[PDB]
């Protein structure tokens, strides 16, 4: 629940950067009918950027309190039922993937046959 929060904070960081770049691009695209439309789009983008900043602050505040163990200690140099349950999902997913393989190779053969037959109908 906390690693997901860290990943969400990271993702929001990339969205913040992307939104800043998009804001600068949109300001560049403005050349003096549709001007009010661009202005409303700019207002929407700025307000959602502010909401994104608020969400990032909330995530940081939540994750800051919850370090006892430092870095560079856990790097390995040269010198219980969860596993049981996980396996079934892996096997089931693998089986599903295998089934998709049969459908895919069949559809591609069908399209190859129709291409070959239709190419020379003239």
């Amino acid at each position: 629940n906390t690693a997901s929060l860290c990943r969400i904070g990271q993702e929001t960081v990339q969205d913040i950067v992307y939104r800043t770049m998009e804001i600068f691009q949109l300001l560049r695209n403005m050349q003096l009918g549709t001007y009010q439309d661009r202005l409303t789009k700019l207002q929407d983008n700025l307000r959602q950027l502010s909401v994104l900043f608020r969400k990032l602050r909330l995530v940081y505040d939540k994750c800051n309190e919850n370090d006892p163990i430092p870095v560079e200690q856990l790097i390995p140099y040269v010198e219980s039922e969860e596993r049981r349950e996980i396996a079934e999902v892996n096997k089931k997913l693998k089986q599903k993937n295998q089934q998709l393989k049969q459908i895919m190779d069949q559809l591609r053969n069908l399209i190859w046959d129709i291409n070959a037959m239709l190419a020379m109908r003239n």
Binding site: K101, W112, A116, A119, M120
Partner: protein, 55 residues
């Protein structure tokens, strides 16, 4: 007949590679217009979660 054979083996080798090793991903897309003598593919190797950075 030759071209059909060769195309089917190329497809089978790409797909066996895709199914046997998962350290880098490998992905193929076939074309859409095709002839009785030629064909084409695009093959693309990317990591599982970094498709935008390393391509």
């Amino acid at each position: 007949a030759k071209h059909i054979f060769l195309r089917s083996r190329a497809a089978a080798t790409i797909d066996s590679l895709a199914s046997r090793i998962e350290d880098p991903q490998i992905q193929a897309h076939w074309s859409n217009i095709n002839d009785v003598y030629e064909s084409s593919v695009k093959v693309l190797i990317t990591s599982q979660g970094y498709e935008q950075i390393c391509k």
